[PDB]
Amino acid sequence: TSIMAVTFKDGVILGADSRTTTGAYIANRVTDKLTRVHDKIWCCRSGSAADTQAIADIVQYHLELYTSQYGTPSTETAASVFKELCYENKDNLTAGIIVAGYDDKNKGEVYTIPLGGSVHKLPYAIAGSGSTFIYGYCDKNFRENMSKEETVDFIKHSLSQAIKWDGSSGGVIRMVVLTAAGVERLIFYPDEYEQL
Amino acid sequence: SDPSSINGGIVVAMTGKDCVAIACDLRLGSQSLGVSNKFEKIFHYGHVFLGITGLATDVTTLNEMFRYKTNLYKLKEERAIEPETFTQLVSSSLYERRFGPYFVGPVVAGINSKSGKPFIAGFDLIGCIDEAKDFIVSGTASDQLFGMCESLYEPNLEPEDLFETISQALLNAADRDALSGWGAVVYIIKKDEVVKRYLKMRQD
Amino acid sequence: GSRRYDSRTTIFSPEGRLYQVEYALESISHAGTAIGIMASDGIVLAAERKVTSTLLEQDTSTEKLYKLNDKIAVAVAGLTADAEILINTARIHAQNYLKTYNEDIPVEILVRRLSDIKQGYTQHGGLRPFGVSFIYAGYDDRYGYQLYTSNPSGNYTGWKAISVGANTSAAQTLLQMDYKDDMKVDDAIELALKTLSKTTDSSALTYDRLEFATIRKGANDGEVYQKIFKPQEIKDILVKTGIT
Amino acid sequence: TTIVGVKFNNGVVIAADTRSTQGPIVADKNCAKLHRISPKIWCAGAGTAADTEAVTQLIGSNIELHSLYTSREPRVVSALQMLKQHLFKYQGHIGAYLIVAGVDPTGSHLFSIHAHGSTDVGYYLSLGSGSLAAMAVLESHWKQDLTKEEAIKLASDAIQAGIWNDLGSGSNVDVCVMEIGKDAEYLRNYLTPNVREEKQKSYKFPRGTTAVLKESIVNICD
Amino acid sequence: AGYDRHITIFSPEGRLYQVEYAFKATNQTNINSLAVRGKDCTVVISQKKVPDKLLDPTTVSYIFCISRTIGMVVNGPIPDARNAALRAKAEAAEFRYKYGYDMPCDVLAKRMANLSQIYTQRAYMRPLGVILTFVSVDEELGPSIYKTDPAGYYVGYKATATGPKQQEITTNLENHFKKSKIDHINEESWEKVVEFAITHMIDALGTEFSKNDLEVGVATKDKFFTLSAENIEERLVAIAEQD
Amino acid sequence: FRNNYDGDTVTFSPTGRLFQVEYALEAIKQGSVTVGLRSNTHAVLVALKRNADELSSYQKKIIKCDEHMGLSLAGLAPDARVLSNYLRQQCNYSSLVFNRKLAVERAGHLLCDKAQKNTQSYGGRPYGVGLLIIGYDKSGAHLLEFQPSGNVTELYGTAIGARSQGAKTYLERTLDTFIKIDGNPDELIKAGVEAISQSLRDESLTVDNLSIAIVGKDTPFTIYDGEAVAKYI
Amino acid sequence: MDIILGIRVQDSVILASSKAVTRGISVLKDSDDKTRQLSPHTLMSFAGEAGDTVQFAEYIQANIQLYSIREDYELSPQAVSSFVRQELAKSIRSRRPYQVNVLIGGYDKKKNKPELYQIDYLGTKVELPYGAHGYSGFYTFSLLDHHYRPDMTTEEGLDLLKLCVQELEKRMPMDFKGVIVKIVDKDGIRQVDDFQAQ
Amino acid sequence: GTGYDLSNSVFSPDGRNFQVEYAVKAVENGTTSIGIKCNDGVVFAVEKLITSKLLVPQKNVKIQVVDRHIGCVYSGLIPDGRHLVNRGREEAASFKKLYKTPIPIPAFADRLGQYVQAHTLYNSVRPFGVSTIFGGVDKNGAHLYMLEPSGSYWGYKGAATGKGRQSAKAELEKLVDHHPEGLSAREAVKQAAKIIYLAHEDNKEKDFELEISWCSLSETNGLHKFVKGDLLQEAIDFAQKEIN
Amino acid sequence: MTDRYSFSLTTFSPSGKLGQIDYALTAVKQGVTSLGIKATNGVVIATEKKSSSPLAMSETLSKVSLLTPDIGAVYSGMGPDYRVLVDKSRKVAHTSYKRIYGEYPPTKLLVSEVAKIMQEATQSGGVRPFGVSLLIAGHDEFNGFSLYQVDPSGSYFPWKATAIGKGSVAAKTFLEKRWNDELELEDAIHIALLTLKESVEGEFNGDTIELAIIGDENPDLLGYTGIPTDKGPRFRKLTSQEINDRLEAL
C-alpha cells in the first residue's frame, strides 16, 4: 500500500495505488483506496481492508448525521471522528488513515492517523508499506503552496517510486483533487509512471 | 483429543427403486476399550429416519432433541414430519450451536409420504446439507465406506437387492476400522413397511 | 404517575375473594358447555360450540378440544386465545419431562404445572388472569384414566364426571343422577350427549355445534389411542344414541 | 472450490464448480454452490460450506423483509452492506467468502466479500482454491463490452480451469445469468465434462449373501 | 372508567380521544402549508408568522432538512416538530448505513407512522401533536409527497394541504386537477412550480404575502433546499407581473 | 383545590406550586431551632436539642462532614443522615482523587442537585430536613442554608426551625457586630448563644440541652456537648 | 482412578466400590463409601475428581428425594438414569464440568426386574449386564465375558466379583484397599459386611 | 370531563398540556432575567432579590457557564435551572469529545430543547419550571435563545422572562427600533442594567442585587466572562441615572 | 422516563365482559367492509378502498397485503394497527418458521402466530388490543386452500366464506345464499364483486376496489428460472384493468 495527501495553493490532492494483496497474490489490482466520507472530505486507507472499510462507513454515517443537524463539518471534525474510533478500538483495529478535506475558510488540510490512534496535522503525509521508500524523496522535493500541476507531479513521482520498490504496492495511481471548483478524479497507468 | 474419534461407529444410507436403506454398527467404545454392543445409531420420528455418528453423548442428546421437536411439530401441523423438512430442521438446529457444536455426523433417510420420492441427506458437525442422490456415509470409517459405496452402488436397486449392497458396504468398511463393528443393523424403508434386520459379523 | 389507571388485578376483596378471578369465572359461565366423563375402559370429552354459522368450516375448526400429548387432551371453556397460550406451554412442559426422564408425563404433574402458572397471574404481576377453565383427560401407568379441571384461580380437582362453561349447575346434577362406577365408554358417550342436549340454550343439538373426543386403550393393541371425532363421525353417533 | 463473476454489456453472470470436499476426500460430486439472496440477486460461496449457506439465507431472509417493507426490488448494495457488516462483527470466524452479483432498478452489479468483511468491486472476479487458475484465464481473454454469450463462455472456461488444474475443484459447471430487463436464468449443470465411465463389472450380490441374525417389522403408524 | 379520555385506551364507541386531541394540537400554531409536485420537482409552501419583534426571523422555521434528498414541513408545536425532525434525521442516517442507499420518502413516512402508531397503542409514550409532510424526488417514484399524522396514518398525495384553513386549500387544488386532468404541475423549471404554489395559496386563503410571510422548500434530483427571503421576493415579483 | 395536586411531588398546581415540597418545608418548621453564623475567621453552629421524655436522651443536631466542614439539621434526622453521608463522600472524593479540600460553595451545589432529583421524578419524596452547612476553605469562612426545594443560599447568619424568626431578626440587627469578631472563637459562640435564646419559649437552655460546633482558620470542625458548653449557659 | 464395578444378576444389582481415598502421596482413608442412596430401590456409585464426585452425588440425591416427596412415588431406574445423564450432558458444556463417572444400580418394582446403567462424565448412558469405569474394565471384562449368565443368583454374582477383585488386587499397580459391596433388590438396598474374607 | 391537568403527558380536549402551562406559572412567579444580542456577542443579566441583610453580596451566583463560550440564565425554580445546565454541560462535553470543535449555539439550543421536550412526554417526569435565556459566540457570529417549559425555543434579538417580563420586553423593543445597525458590547452591558432596574418596579417592595455577564468576540475573545469591578459599577450608575 | 404501565389495561368487568376487547370489536364494526370467499381451486379476498381525499393516491395505500408468496391478508377497522401487524406477520413467518424449516409456514400456523401477538395485546402491561379484525387467505401443500378470521381477542375461525366491517351482517346473509362447495375461482370472484356492491355507496370500479386471489402458481411472477420445484407465488393482486373486465359481466 502506498498512500499520500498533499495540501497546496488551491486545496488538497489525495493519492493512492490500487494493489491489495493476500500474501504474495494480488487479490485486486484495481482497488480504490480513496474513500469519500463527505462531499469535500476524503480519506486514504492502509492496513486491514476490512477494518478501514468499516471505519470509513461509520465516519460517513456520523458526518451525514452531523450535516443534517449542524451543516457541513470541518476537516478537523472528520479527523476527530476517525480518531475516536481508531483510538478507542486500538486493540482490534489495524488501520493507517490519512484524512484530507477542503474548506472555504481553512483551505486544504491533512491529518494523519497511524496505528496507535493519534492525530497529526501536517502539510503533507505519507503512509502504507511503500511510504518507507519515499521518505527521503518527499522531504527533499515538497514545497508549500505549489500549483495543481506541480502537486500532481509531486504525488505521481513519489508514488511511482513507492510502487517501484514495494511489492505490496502497484497497479494504477489514483488521485482525488479537492478545491473550490469541486472534486476531480485522476488516474495514471503503469505505462506512464514507470518510465518517470 | 478428537471428540468424533472417542466413541467410534458408522452410519450409511442408500437410495433404491421406490425405497431407501439406512444402516449402522452397534459398537460403543472408549478409545481402545469396547463398552457396548447394543448402541443403536438409527432413530425414527414417524416415517423419517435419522442416523447419528460421533460423540455418543451428543447422539443421545440430539435424538432426544429431535423427538422433542417432531412431537411439537406433529401437534401444531396435525401431520407427520417430512424428510425434506426434517433435513432443514437438523441443519438449523446444528448451526444454532455454531461456535459450540455437537460433535456429530447426522444422516437423514426416508420417503416422502405425498410424492413417494426416496430421500437421503448428510451433515457435518455444524450443519452443512449434503444432498446426494446415491449414498450418504458418516463415521470413523467414512473413507472405508466411501470406497465401498462408490464401487458397489448402482442406481435403481430393488429393496431385496439394495439390502445386500448396503450390508456388504457396512460390514467390509467396519472390518477395516478399529472403532467400528460389534454387530450391525439395517433398515429397509418402503412407502408402506419398514424391515429391520440384524446382521451377523465379526466380534473383534 | 400510572397509579391512577391501575385496576389492581391481584388484590383481595373485603370478603376475602379475588375480584378478577370471580369476574373471570363469570366469563366462563357464558362460554360453551364442555363435559368430561371417566369410565372403566376410557374417557369421553364432549363440548358445545359457541356461536356457529352455516359458512363456518367445521372440518378445519378447533376451538374447544385440544391435544396436549399422545395420552393427554383438554376441553376448553372461556377465551380460546388465552387457552392456546396455556396449551402451548403445556405442550412444551410435557416434552421437557419426556426429554428429562424418557417417560411420558403423568397427568397430574402437567395439570399442577398449568394450574401454578394460572396462580402466578393471581398473586403477582398486575396482569389480568387467564379466562379459561380446562377439563384434563389423560392416561398414565400409575392412576390409569384420569379427569381433572382447573379454573382462573389456579385450583385443580379430580373428577369422575365434570362440566365446565355454561349451565354447569344443571349439567352436574344430570351427571350425578345417571353416573355409576362400572360405566362403559359407549354408555359414557350417551350420557355426555344427553346431558348437553338437555342443557343447550339453542333449539336442537346438531353435529355442526359439537366437538367430540374419546381416549381408549385398544383391546386389540395394548396401547392408549386418542380419537378426535370428525364432523361425519359426530353426526353418526348423534343418531345412534337417539337424538338424530 | 472455484467461483467466478463476469460483467457483460447488459448484466452480470456467475459460475461455480460442483465439488465439495472433506479434506482430500470428495463428499459431494454435484453440490449447489450458486445460492439465491433474492429472485434477481445470486451468490457464489467459497470456504466453510455451512457458513456460506447460512449467511446467504440469513441476509436473504432480511432482504425479503426489507423488500416487503420498502415496497421495492432488492438491491445488490443492500445485500452487500448487510453481508459485510455481519461478517465484520464476527471478525472472520464465519468463514464465508462470497461473490455476490445481481440486477436491480439501479443496474447490474458485481462484488466479492471476504470473511473479515472487506469488499471489492470489479468486472471479473474469482475466489476459492481454484481462484488463481480461473483468474489466469480471466486476465487472458477478458475484454470490455462483452456480449451475453461471450460472458457465459468466459466464465465457464474460467471454472473449467479450476476443474482441471486445481485439486480442490472438479466435476460440473453451474452458471447463473442475470440480465437487466429479464428474469435471472439459473443453469444447473450447464456443462458436465466429468461423467463417470461405466464400471468393468457389476457388483450386484446374489440374494442371501449377507447373514441375518434377527428380523422384525418397524412400527411407523401411531 | 372515565380515564379512557386520558390514556390511549378504547372508549365505549371504539375511539381514541388522546389521538383525537393530538390532531387538535396541530392547529395550535395557526399556520397553513401546501405541497405540490412538478415534472421533476416537489415544492412545499408554509406560512411564516413572526408576531414578536424581538424574535430572530431566520430561526423561525417549520421546514426541516432531513437528508440530502428528503425535506419535511410540520404542522404543530415546534417542540414536537423538532422531536420528529431529529428522529427522522437519525432514521435517515441509519438506513443509509445499514442498507447502502438513501432512504426513500415513502419508507421514512412509513417508519415515522409506525412510531406514531406505537404511541397510539402503548400507554406511556404520548402521541406527538404534529402532522408531518415529507417531500423529495425519489430515484424510483419521482416527485413524492407523503404525510403522517398522530393516528399513525400515512398515504401518498398528488398534492396536499395542512392547517386550520386546510379545506380551503384542498378544494382549490382539487378544482385545478379536475381541470388539468393530470396528477402533477406540468412545468419544467421548479421556479414556476413555486410560483404556482404561491398563487394558489393566495387564491384559496384570500391573503397577499410578502417576502417574510412565506417559507419555501424545494426538492429536486439528489437535493432538497430551502429558499431565502430574497429568493421568495424574486418569485413574488414574477407572479405580480401576471395579475 | 389543594387535595388534587398534592398526591405526589411530580404534580404541579394551577398556580405553579409544588405542595409535596411545601409539606417537606413544613417538617422543618415543626423541628427544633438551630442557628448558624460566621465572621471572617470562624464559623459557628448553635443547635437546640429535643428530647421525647425526661428519661430520653437529647437527639443530636450537628453532624461532622470533614475536618473543615460540618452541618446542623432541622426536621427528619434520617434524611439528614443520608444527605450528610453523601456530603461526607463528596468531601472524601475530592481529597482522595484531587488532594483538594472541597469548597463549601461547591458542597452546596452538590446538595442542591441531589435534592432536585427527588422533586422531578415519580415515586420519590422530597427530603424532610433543612441543613445549615458551615466550613472554612481557601476563600475563608462560609455559612450555607439548605432547603428541601433545592435552594441553597450563602449567608452571614441564619436560623431554621420552630420560632426561628426571633433568632433571624436578632442576627439581622447584630449583623455589623458579629462579622468583625475575628481571632476570637469564644465571643462568636456567645453571639450565637444569645441568638438561639431569642427563639426560646418552652424552656431555658441547659447543660445537656445545648449543642455547639465551630470551624475556623486554625480550628478543625469540632462538636461540643454537655460539660463543654456549660461556660456558655 | 477408583474401582467402580457393577453386575446385574437374576433378581438384583450388585455394586462394588473401592474404599481408598488417595491425595497426592498418602492414602487418607481406607473405609470410604463411594455410593449414595437416591431412592429406596435405587443406588448410585461414583468416582472421579476429588470435589466434584460427592457434590454431584448429593445433588442428584436431593433432587430424586424432592421428586419422591412431591409425587409420593418412586421413579423407575430408567427415569433416574436419564435424569442423571442430562445433568452430566449439561455439565460437559458449562464453565467447569463435573468430572464424575457413575453407575446406577436399581430395581424396578413395576417391571420386577433389576437394572444397571453406566454413565460417564460426558453423559454417555448405556444399560449393561455388567459395567466398570476407568481402568477397572481392562482387568475385569474378560472374566465377566466368560462367566456371566443372566440367570445367575446373588451368591453366584458375589463369587464373580470376588474373582474380579482378586484380578485387580494382583495386576493393578494401585492399592484400592478392598471394596464395599452392596445389593439392590426388591426388598431394598443392603450392604455385604462380609466381603473382606468371603 | 375533568382531570386533564392532573397528569403530565395527557392531552386536554383543546389539545393542550396543562402541566406544562402550570410550570409556566412557576416561571412567571420567579425573578426577572434578560438577554441582549449585540453586534459581536451577547449580554446576560439577572435580578437578585435581597430577602435579608444577612445574604452575602456577590456570592449567590445565578448565571451559569456552559463549556467556555456559552452563558445561561433562567427564571423560576432555580434547582430546575441547574439540572438543565448540568445536562447542557454533559451534552457540550459529549460534542467536543467527538467533533473536537466547541458546540455551536444553535446546536446547543436543540440539545436543551430535546431534553426539555422529553420531560413533557411521560407522566413519570415533571416539566421544567424554568425559562432559560442562553447564548454565546461560535463559528459564525453571535446567537441568543430563550427556552420554554414546553421545549419550545427561538432565536432572539432580545429575550425576557420572569416577574417583570412585560416591562423588559417593552424596553427591549425600543432598542431594536432605535438601533437597527446594531448595539455594541459596551452599550449592551450598560443597557442590561437599565432594563432590570425598570423591570424591578414590578417587585419594588424588596431590595435587589445586579448581576451581569457577557460573551463578546472583541471584548472577551468569544469567551463567557462575568462583569466585575469598575464595569459593573459603571452599569449601576448608568441605570441609577436614568431611573430618576 | 421508564414505562410505569406494567399492569393490564384490559380487565374483567363484574359481568365477565372484557371491555377493551368489546370496544375494539366496535371499532372493527365502524371499519370498511371486507370479505373472503373460498373456492375449490382458490381463495378470494376483497375490500373497498375508502379514500380520505381525491388528491390522495389510493395506489400508495394497500389494504390487501402479501404475507408469504402463498398467503395474503385483508382487514376491517384501524388502518395503522393493520400495517404494523403485517410487518410483524411477515417477520414471524421467517423468524419462527422459515429460518427453522427452510420453507414458508402453512396458513393455520401463521394465523396462530398473528393471533398470539393480538392475544398478548390483551394481557400484557401498558398496551391496548388491536382495533382490527383480519381475514387471512392462503395455501399450503398439505392443507390446500383455507380462509381464516382473526379477532382483537386473538381468536381465530376457519371460514368457507365470511365478511367483516360495516355491512357484515347483510354481507354474510348474501354469502350464505350464493356459496356452494363446487365453486370455481372465477365464480368466487363474481360473488365477491356482487357482495361488495351492496356495501359500496359511491363509485364501483377497479380504482376504488382492492382485490387479491390465492390460486395457481405464477411462474411469470417468480423472477427467476432454473429450479423445477420453484414454480412461483400463489398470491396475486388483481390490477385495476382485471377488475374492470369482470365488472362488465356483472
Tab-separated table of N, CA, C and O in Angstrom, chain C residues 46-95:
chain	number	residue	atom	x	y	z
C	46	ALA	N	-66.805	-34.160	25.520
C	46	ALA	CA	-67.835	-33.577	24.664
C	46	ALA	C	-67.987	-32.089	24.957
C	46	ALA	O	-68.036	-31.683	26.119
C	47	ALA	N	-68.061	-31.283	23.900
C	47	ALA	CA	-68.148	-29.831	24.045
C	47	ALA	C	-69.086	-29.191	23.025
C	47	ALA	O	-69.147	-29.617	21.869
C	48	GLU	N	-69.808	-28.165	23.467
C	48	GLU	CA	-70.752	-27.440	22.620
C	48	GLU	C	-70.118	-26.164	22.069
C	48	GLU	O	-69.673	-25.302	22.831
C	49	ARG	N	-70.086	-26.056	20.742
C	49	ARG	CA	-69.516	-24.895	20.058
C	49	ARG	C	-70.375	-23.650	20.261
C	49	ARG	O	-71.591	-23.682	20.055
C	50	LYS	N	-69.731	-22.559	20.667
C	50	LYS	CA	-70.414	-21.288	20.884
C	50	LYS	C	-70.368	-20.433	19.620
C	50	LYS	O	-69.299	-20.238	19.036
C	51	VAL	N	-71.538	-19.932	19.220
C	51	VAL	CA	-71.719	-19.098	18.017
C	51	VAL	C	-71.260	-19.809	16.738
C	51	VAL	O	-70.066	-19.854	16.426
C	52	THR	N	-72.223	-20.366	16.008
C	52	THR	CA	-71.937	-21.110	14.782
C	52	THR	C	-72.690	-20.546	13.581
C	52	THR	O	-73.800	-20.024	13.718
C	53	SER	N	-72.073	-20.657	12.408
C	53	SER	CA	-72.681	-20.225	11.153
C	53	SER	C	-72.688	-21.366	10.136
C	53	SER	O	-71.967	-22.355	10.293
C	54	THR	N	-73.512	-21.221	9.099
C	54	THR	CA	-73.609	-22.209	8.022
C	54	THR	C	-72.319	-22.245	7.197
C	54	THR	O	-71.927	-23.297	6.686
C	55	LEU	N	-71.665	-21.091	7.087
C	55	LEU	CA	-70.441	-20.946	6.301
C	55	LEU	C	-69.166	-21.119	7.132
C	55	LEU	O	-68.062	-20.843	6.655
C	56	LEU	N	-69.324	-21.581	8.371
C	56	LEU	CA	-68.190	-21.890	9.235
C	56	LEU	C	-67.631	-23.266	8.878
C	56	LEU	O	-68.347	-24.270	8.929
C	57	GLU	N	-66.353	-23.298	8.509
C	57	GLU	CA	-65.678	-24.539	8.131
C	57	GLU	C	-65.369	-25.380	9.369
C	57	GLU	O	-64.371	-25.151	10.054
C	58	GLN	N	-66.239	-26.348	9.646
C	58	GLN	CA	-66.120	-27.202	10.829
C	58	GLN	C	-64.988	-28.224	10.703
C	58	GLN	O	-64.382	-28.613	11.704
C	59	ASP	N	-64.710	-28.646	9.469
C	59	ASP	CA	-63.691	-29.662	9.185
C	59	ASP	C	-62.277	-29.241	9.592
C	59	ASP	O	-61.445	-30.087	9.925
C	60	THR	N	-62.017	-27.936	9.561
C	60	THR	CA	-60.712	-27.387	9.929
C	60	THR	C	-60.792	-26.617	11.256
C	60	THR	O	-59.813	-26.005	11.692
C	61	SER	N	-61.958	-26.669	11.899
C	61	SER	CA	-62.210	-25.896	13.116
C	61	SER	C	-61.820	-26.629	14.395
C	61	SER	O	-62.106	-27.819	14.561
C	62	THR	N	-61.163	-25.896	15.291
C	62	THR	CA	-60.768	-26.395	16.604
C	62	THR	C	-60.772	-25.223	17.586
C	62	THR	O	-59.940	-24.316	17.487
C	63	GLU	N	-61.719	-25.242	18.522
C	63	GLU	CA	-61.875	-24.148	19.484
C	63	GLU	C	-62.003	-24.613	20.938
C	63	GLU	O	-61.777	-23.830	21.864
C	64	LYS	N	-62.363	-25.881	21.135
C	64	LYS	CA	-62.622	-26.399	22.480
C	64	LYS	C	-61.798	-27.638	22.847
C	64	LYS	O	-61.317	-27.747	23.974
C	65	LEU	N	-61.635	-28.559	21.901
C	65	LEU	CA	-60.898	-29.800	22.157
C	65	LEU	C	-59.494	-29.785	21.558
C	65	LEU	O	-59.326	-29.815	20.336
C	66	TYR	N	-58.492	-29.745	22.434
C	66	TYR	CA	-57.092	-29.654	22.023
C	66	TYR	C	-56.259	-30.830	22.527
C	66	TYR	O	-56.501	-31.357	23.614
C	67	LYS	N	-55.271	-31.221	21.725
C	67	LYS	CA	-54.375	-32.320	22.059
C	67	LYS	C	-53.068	-31.788	22.649
C	67	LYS	O	-52.339	-31.039	21.992
C	68	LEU	N	-52.784	-32.174	23.890
C	68	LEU	CA	-51.557	-31.763	24.573
C	68	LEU	C	-50.457	-32.799	24.386
C	68	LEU	O	-49.310	-32.459	24.090
C	69	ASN	N	-50.826	-34.064	24.564
C	69	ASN	CA	-49.902	-35.186	24.478
C	69	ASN	C	-50.573	-36.336	23.734
C	69	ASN	O	-51.751	-36.245	23.386
C	70	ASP	N	-49.827	-37.412	23.488
C	70	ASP	CA	-50.391	-38.624	22.889
C	70	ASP	C	-51.409	-39.302	23.808
C	70	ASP	O	-52.220	-40.114	23.357
C	71	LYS	N	-51.362	-38.957	25.093
C	71	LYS	CA	-52.233	-39.559	26.100
C	71	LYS	C	-53.123	-38.536	26.812
C	71	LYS	O	-54.120	-38.906	27.431
C	72	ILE	N	-52.762	-37.256	26.716
C	72	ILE	CA	-53.476	-36.186	27.423
C	72	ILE	C	-54.136	-35.192	26.458
C	72	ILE	O	-53.513	-34.743	25.493
C	73	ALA	N	-55.401	-34.868	26.729
C	73	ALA	CA	-56.159	-33.885	25.949
C	73	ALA	C	-56.982	-32.968	26.858
C	73	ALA	O	-57.263	-33.315	28.009
C	74	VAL	N	-57.368	-31.804	26.337
C	74	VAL	CA	-58.122	-30.814	27.116
C	74	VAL	C	-59.417	-30.338	26.462
C	74	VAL	O	-59.519	-30.265	25.236
C	75	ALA	N	-60.398	-30.020	27.304
C	75	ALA	CA	-61.624	-29.351	26.879
C	75	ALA	C	-61.605	-27.912	27.389
C	75	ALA	O	-61.365	-27.669	28.573
C	76	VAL	N	-61.859	-26.966	26.487
C	76	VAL	CA	-61.710	-25.539	26.784
C	76	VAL	C	-63.053	-24.841	27.005
C	76	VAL	O	-63.996	-25.027	26.235
C	77	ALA	N	-63.122	-24.045	28.070
C	77	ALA	CA	-64.251	-23.154	28.313
C	77	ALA	C	-63.740	-21.759	28.664
C	77	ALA	O	-62.990	-21.586	29.628
C	78	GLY	N	-64.141	-20.773	27.867
C	78	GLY	CA	-63.734	-19.385	28.072
C	78	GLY	C	-63.089	-18.783	26.839
C	78	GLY	O	-63.536	-19.025	25.715
C	79	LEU	N	-62.037	-17.996	27.053
C	79	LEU	CA	-61.309	-17.353	25.962
C	79	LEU	C	-60.405	-18.353	25.247
C	79	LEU	O	-59.504	-18.935	25.854
C	80	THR	N	-60.659	-18.544	23.954
C	80	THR	CA	-59.918	-19.506	23.135
C	80	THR	C	-58.451	-19.093	22.970
C	80	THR	O	-57.557	-19.942	22.990
C	81	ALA	N	-58.221	-17.792	22.818
C	81	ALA	CA	-56.876	-17.244	22.640
C	81	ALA	C	-56.018	-17.386	23.898
C	81	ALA	O	-54.822	-17.666	23.808
C	82	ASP	N	-56.639	-17.189	25.061
C	82	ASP	CA	-55.969	-17.360	26.350
C	82	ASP	C	-55.627	-18.825	26.612
C	82	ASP	O	-54.620	-19.130	27.257
C	83	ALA	N	-56.472	-19.722	26.106
C	83	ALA	CA	-56.281	-21.161	26.262
C	83	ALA	C	-55.092	-21.666	25.454
C	83	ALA	O	-54.306	-22.473	25.949
C	84	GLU	N	-54.959	-21.177	24.221
C	84	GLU	CA	-53.870	-21.582	23.326
C	84	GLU	C	-52.486	-21.196	23.851
C	84	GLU	O	-51.500	-21.877	23.560
C	85	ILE	N	-52.423	-20.106	24.616
C	85	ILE	CA	-51.192	-19.691	25.293
C	85	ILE	C	-50.794	-20.737	26.336
C	85	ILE	O	-49.632	-21.146	26.407
C	86	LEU	N	-51.773	-21.173	27.127
C	86	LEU	CA	-51.556	-22.179	28.165
C	86	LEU	C	-51.349	-23.575	27.574
C	86	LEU	O	-50.532	-24.351	28.076
C	87	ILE	N	-52.085	-23.879	26.505
C	87	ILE	CA	-51.967	-25.156	25.792
C	87	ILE	C	-50.566	-25.341	25.202
C	87	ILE	O	-50.003	-26.438	25.262
C	88	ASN	N	-50.005	-24.265	24.654
C	88	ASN	CA	-48.647	-24.285	24.112
C	88	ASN	C	-47.595	-24.571	25.184
C	88	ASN	O	-46.708	-25.398	24.976
C	89	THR	N	-47.709	-23.896	26.327
C	89	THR	CA	-46.777	-24.083	27.445
C	89	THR	C	-46.879	-25.487	28.043
C	89	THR	O	-45.879	-26.047	28.496
C	90	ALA	N	-48.089	-26.043	28.035
C	90	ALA	CA	-48.332	-27.409	28.500
C	90	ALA	C	-47.701	-28.441	27.567
C	90	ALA	O	-47.232	-29.488	28.019
C	91	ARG	N	-47.699	-28.136	26.270
C	91	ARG	CA	-47.077	-28.995	25.264
C	91	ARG	C	-45.555	-29.013	25.407
C	91	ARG	O	-44.931	-30.065	25.261
C	92	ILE	N	-44.971	-27.848	25.693
C	92	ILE	CA	-43.534	-27.735	25.957
C	92	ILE	C	-43.153	-28.464	27.254
C	92	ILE	O	-42.141	-29.169	27.299
C	93	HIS	N	-43.981	-28.306	28.287
C	93	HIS	CA	-43.746	-28.936	29.591
C	93	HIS	C	-43.778	-30.439	29.519
C	93	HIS	O	-42.961	-31.112	30.152
C	94	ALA	N	-44.722	-30.971	28.744
C	94	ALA	CA	-44.850	-32.413	28.531
C	94	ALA	C	-43.626	-32.988	27.822
C	94	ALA	O	-43.175	-34.091	28.143
C	95	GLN	N	-43.094	-32.230	26.865
C	95	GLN	CA	-41.913	-32.640	26.110
C	95	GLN	C	-40.625	-32.460	26.911
C	95	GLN	O	-39.658	-33.197	26.707
